[PDB]
Each structure stands twice: as structure tokens, then as C-alpha cells.
């Protein structure tokens, strides 16, 4: 099937900026490439069709250009409404194929995370279940690392990570790595610490809870 | 032109789903109704399309024999029925109008989706409806400032995804970070909502969270207090 | 006054003052395997033409038709 690859997988940029998103086709699709925008929890919306044509009611800021295999989307004046995943979908072949999508973020000042460790609640500890949640709060570069060291032993393969979408006012991010350990291995240790490695942090910040 | 699809559907491995897509304001015949599924945090995948005028349905090779697309001009409603549902079929399903361009040979489809419908989510799992277990997040051992006021509630072991957590019934909006849900091997989901309020502001205001898992009608409010 | 319009491709009462039916024909990429993209409709002036556009304008009713 015609394979289409949008190159700017993620592209952070300020509202006072102009952004261009690339989509490459495996086959010459000529002027048959449509452009769409998907905001979270919302269905895609067609911005540009037939490569350059713009649908009725689409901010002129949105301009599209290209032919053959290489195409470009120009968002012109970024407005907060214009920050979302954008998709390129050819119209040349029966197997209609889409690009992976490019997420437009808000370039903000580098902000360091606020690290917090939450010990297992006794109500949960009654059951064999024991969960330890670590919270990084308001960090700008989303790229962040979390380690889980118990009694100074790195703990890999026992934690799951969930990240919040960029905040509205702060334009920052928040992360939560919850380690899952049976009541047994829990009471079988003393130190429970969370390491945090981030761009804004000069030194790794490792908080700790010693209750065993 | 508007497209109004079915509601969410929870289905088991091997089961079959049929999703409604209702077209309004536009000529249903002169148009074509395709379908495109979006797996969680994934891209969009064309599943197939049906041009009523021709009555024929063009299906992708993948989904050939499992997808059956139908149209009822009477109700101007279009239907996508996927069978042999697998876990990986857990995704949002969208219905989209495709304009038709008239060439000399015959009316052909223009691969532009001018209109898209409110998505329908089909969640395929071998799990059954389970209510969540709200567990509280205690502070940073009454810290001086390394704690500020980071408190929260843990929503764990809840199966039908929709789950809504709020603080002080809407009084606490600033500083609230309800996280995205994460699926565990158990086949159940876990979520956490953590609020960064003022440190000194702790007994002054009682901080309680409000869980609403309507699938199992479990509305639980648990107090969050230091130690 | 009553000619054919492409997108719905039905006999659509042509609007007041408009008594034409342009059968605009031109070739796109797939002109090779499909044929000239056909375009019918209404007008009050035989529409203008581009190097590859060709247009036959009826003046009677339902005479802006498409080959099978």
C-alpha cells in the first residue's frame, strides 16, 4: 500500500511562530494528498484537500503545498486553537493511507519537575496489593526519566508511567510512575526511593520513603 | 452535513460489533460513507467504504472477510460490522463522508473525508465490569516545602474505561492533575488524580476526591488527610 | 432553466436568470484510466475555459447530460 511518513513526529513551537509539517509518499501520488487536524478526544477535521485547496471555513493560516511524493503544511500564525496532531492522507490509491501524525506542542521555558513519593495506603496493603506512586509536576521538556530504587536496588519491569497533556495556563507537563509490588516483597524491603532525571534538573533529584 | 454514530460498546473476544453512522443535511446517495478506526494513542486506519449508488463496498485486504459495511437509504444510516473481535480491535471507530467526483467512465470517489462523525469506541476485553478501589495519596511526611501540598487519590482495578475524578465537587480546579488511565495485565485500569494546593493550607480546607465509574455506578468520595 | 448539476448529478432547477448547462471536460492525472473529469450545472454565460477545459452549453431543459 502507498506508505506515507510525516517527518516532524513532534514539533514544539510558540504562538508567535510559523510551522511547516512534512509528509513523504512511497509512490508519486501527484496532487492527491489531504491534510487533517485531530485534537484530543475529537474526530479528525479536513484542513486542506487536493494538496493546496482549503476547505470552506478553514483558517487561511492553514496553507498546503507539494506534489509527487513530498508535501508540506504551513500553519502560518500559530494560535492556541491550532495546536494538535495533524495527519496526511493520500487519495491516489484504494488503500487510503495516513501519516503517523505530528503533535504541535507549545515551546515554553525549561521547567524542573517537582518530585513527590506516595506510600502504599493501609487499605490497599490489607490486600496483597501495594502501589507506590511518584509524581513529577509542571516540567516543560516532556522527555523525562524515572528510576525506582528499593534498598538501593534499581527496580525495572515493575512500574507503569502515565503523562498528562500539556497544561492550559502553565503549558507544562506532569508524569506519574506507579510501582506495583506484592505486600510480600514490600514488607521484605526498607527503602523505597524514586529517581528523576530531567533537562531542567542539573543534578538527579532522588526522593525517598523509609518505612519498609 | 453531520454524522452521528452509535454509543460506546464493550465486547468480548470472538464477539461481533455493529456501529451506526447517521448522515444528515446532505445527499446520502451522491456521497460515499467510509470507516476508519483509531487505536488508542495510534494513527488512523481506513477499514472500508460503501458507495450506495453502486451498492458495492470496497474493503481493505486486512479486514477482508471480517468487516461488512452496509447502508440503508431509508434511514440514511450506514453500518460497519466487525466480527471475530480481538483485543487489538480495541479502538475508536469513525465514519466519514467521502465526496464523489464524476469522471467520464463513471462517478468515482475522491479520497477526501469532508465530514467525520463523533467517534464510537469499541473496547474488546475478556474482563467484566468491575468498580474501582479509591486509595488515598498521603503528603511528603509533613515536609517543610519539599511537600507544598501534593495530595491525591488512586483509582485502581476498574474495568470499563470511562472514570471521572474531581476535587471538592469542582471547588478545586487549579492544581488538579487527573492522569490518563493505564491498563494492567489484570485487564483492569488504574488512574491517579493529584492536587498541588498550599502546604500551610491543609486542615483549613478538607480535600476530598469524587470518583464516578458509571459503568458500575460506583460514586466514591474519600477524604485525603496528612498521615 | 432546469438542467443537470454534477455533485448530486440530478436535474436541478437551474436558478433564476441562469439558463445554461456547462459540460466542462478536462483531464487530470487519472484521465489516463478514467477519462475527462465531467462537470455539468447551470450558468447565465457559457462559462470560461482553460487550455485543457472544454465545455458544451445546452439552453433547453435536462440537456446537460453525462455519457453512460
Numbering used by the authors:
A (entry chain L): 1 to 212
B (entry chain H): 2 to 52, 52a, 53 to 82, 82a, 82b, 82c, 83 to 100, 100a, ...
C (entry chain C): 1 to 68
Lines quoted from the article behind this entry:
3FTxs are among the most abundant and lethal toxins present in the venom of elapids, a major medically relevant family of snakes that includes cobras, kraits, and mambas. Because α-neurotoxins are abundantly produced by a wide range of elapids, they are considered key targets for antivenom development. Here, we used a synthetic human antibody library to find and develop an antibody that neutralizes long-chain three-finger α-neurotoxins produced by numerous medically relevant snakes. Our antibody bound diverse toxin variants with high affinity, blocked toxin binding to the nicotinic acetyl-choline receptor in vitro, and protected mice from lethal venom challenge.
Structural analysis of the antibody-toxin complex revealed a binding mode that mimics the receptor-toxin interaction. The interaction surface is contributed primarily by CDRH3, although CDRs H1, L1, and L2 provide hydrophobic interactions and H bonds. For the LC, 95Mat5 CDRL1 Tyr32 hydroxyl hydrogen-bonds with Gly29 and Phe30 backbone amides as well as Asp28 carboxyl. The antibody and the receptor interact with similar toxin residues. Tyr100 and Tyr100e in 95Mat5 align with Tyr190 and Tyr198 of nAChRα1, respectively. Tyr100 is completely conserved among our cross-reactive antibodies. The equivalent α-bungarotoxin residues Asp30, Phe32, Arg36, Gly37, Lys38, and Pro69 also play an important role in nAChR binding. All of the cross-reactive antibodies used a 19– or 20–amino acid CDRH3 loop with most containing a [W/Y]YxxGxY motif, suggesting that all of the mAbs likely use the same overall mode of binding. In vivo protection studies revealed the cross-neutralization potential of 95Mat5, which not only protected against purified α-bungarotoxin (B. multicinctus, krait), but also completely neutralized the neurotoxin-rich whole venoms of N. kaouthia (monocellate cobra) and D. polylepis (black mamba) and prolonged animal survival against O. hannah (king cobra). The efficacy of 95Mat5 was reduced against O. hannah venom (20% survival at 24 hours), although increased animal survival times compared with dose-matched antivenom were observed.
